[PDB]
């Protein structure tokens, strides 16, 4: 209503609100930040490295429903990525050695 706060704002350490929700494993705050259409770029990599099954399930399952008018336009958040740009989610899941995330990724034709 007021446009006061950029929801995709970063911190001094390079984490966003969604990454802070993922690191603390707050599924409620994670889904609440997802419901307002925040930026979701590379958050699945942070969830896979954190080895949270519920966060990986939420990031896999929420990206499909309720996508309307592209994404809201956002600029200059995309420079800082802890994960390398060559990395893909199945490869990082293989590096993490977690079984459930690998199974959920393999089920989706990867």
């Amino acid at each position: 209503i007021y446009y006061n706060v950029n929801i995709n704002c970063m911190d001094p350490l390079g984490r966003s609100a969604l990454l802070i929700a993922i690191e603390n494993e707050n599924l409620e705050i994670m889904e609440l930040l997802l419901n307002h259409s925040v930026y979701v770029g590379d958050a699945l990599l942070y969830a896979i490295r954190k080895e949270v099954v519920g966060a990986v399930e939420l990031l896999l399952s929420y990206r499909r429903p309720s996508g309307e008018k592209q994404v809201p336009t956002l600029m200059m958040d995309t420079q800082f990525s802890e994960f390398t740009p060559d990395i893909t989610p199945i490869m990082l899941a293989a590096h993490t050695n977690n079984y459930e995330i690998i199974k959920l990724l393999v089920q989706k034709r990867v």
Binding site: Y2, N4, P72
Partner: protein
């Protein structure tokens, strides 16, 4: 190319500036286009007198004459011209009109109601000023294209109300300039969507958002302190302290206007980095808007060299 956003709270004058970009930069509304606004003039007139009558209950105001009670019943069901005239000229109705800050009344109400004889003729064709004075809410975006000084203006009119905010985020890409409209005459008014919210504080907090947003670091920020004509009249009867309890200046146009300008310009949190280009405007005055928009265009050219 110049991407130009018209922003501001509800009823601040955005779409009226858009109407002016038609006539000022182009042949403008045709008789036939004027005729299309007749039903809007009528609706604005009828809805305005209804609003005043309705408010008389909330305000504990009686009709100057008992005979108006049946005119009021007739008005709601609906000869119509006669009924509206008698109501409008009633002393109770006029007492309520005088207190319109205590309810929600269109700015052009008295404009039309005072011209009822003219607008009620069977052959009535709205004048260009009648069109400029019309009130039609603006929901969604109104992108129109115009060319000034050979610039290809891509102009975005958007809804000023808080319900219309969702559309604003999509249009923020590549904005050369924002004209942010503020109704000067709103210090004592409350929002239609929130009657515990003063309109001028709402306009400040948005301007706090829009001026300091990181999307508009390189965008030229133009402030139209609009409805200068209405403000000039109102300031002589409604004190600025309603809005700004700390104000110790005069209730005169020049001093009170200057103070409002200062309050808005103070919201800039990057004053040693960014200008606000402020103009006092009457959006319904073609000559004024042409002069101001010319000046604005010069600022935009100079800022894109």
């Amino acid at each position: 190319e110049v991407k130009l956003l018209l922003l501001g709270a509800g009823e601040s004058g955005k779409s009226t500036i858009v109407k002016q970009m038609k006539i000022i930069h182009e042949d403008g509304y045709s008789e036939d286009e004027c005729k299309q606004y007749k039903v809007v003039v009528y609706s604005n007139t009828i809805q305005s007198i209804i609003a005043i009558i309705r408010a008389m209950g909330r305000l504990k105001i009686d009709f100057g004459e008992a005979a108006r009670a049946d005119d009021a019943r007739q008005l709601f069901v609906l000869e119509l011209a006669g009924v509206i005239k008698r109501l409008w000229r009633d002393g109770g109705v006029q007492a309520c009109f005088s207190r319109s800050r205590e309810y929600q009344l269109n700015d052009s109400a008295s404009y039309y109601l005072n011209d009822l004889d003219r607008i009620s003729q069977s052959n009535y064709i709205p004048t260009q000023q009648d069109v400029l004075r019309t009130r039609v809410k603006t929901t969604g975006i109104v992108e129109t294209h115009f060319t000034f000084k050979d610039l290809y203006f891509k102009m975005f009119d958007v809804g000023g109300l808080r319900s219309e905010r969702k559309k604003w985020i999509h249009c923020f890409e590549g904005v050369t300039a924002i004209i942010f409209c503020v109704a000067l005459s709103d210090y004592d008014l409350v929002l239609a969507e929130d009657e515990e919210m003063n309109r001028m504080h709402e306009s400040m907090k948005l301007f706090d958002s829009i001026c300091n947003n990181k999307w508009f670091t390189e965008t030229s920020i133009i402030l139209f302190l609009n409805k200068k004509d209405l403000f000039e009249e109102k300031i002589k009867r409604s004190p600025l302290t309603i809005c700004y309890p700390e104000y110790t200046g005069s209730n005169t146009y020049e001093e009170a206007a200057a103070y409002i300008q200062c309050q808005f310009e103070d919201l800039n949190r990057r004053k040693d980095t960014k200008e606000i280009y402020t103009h006092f405007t009457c959006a319904t005055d073609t000559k004024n808007v042409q002069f101001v928009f010319d000046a604005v265009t010069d600022v935009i050219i100079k800022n894109n060299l």
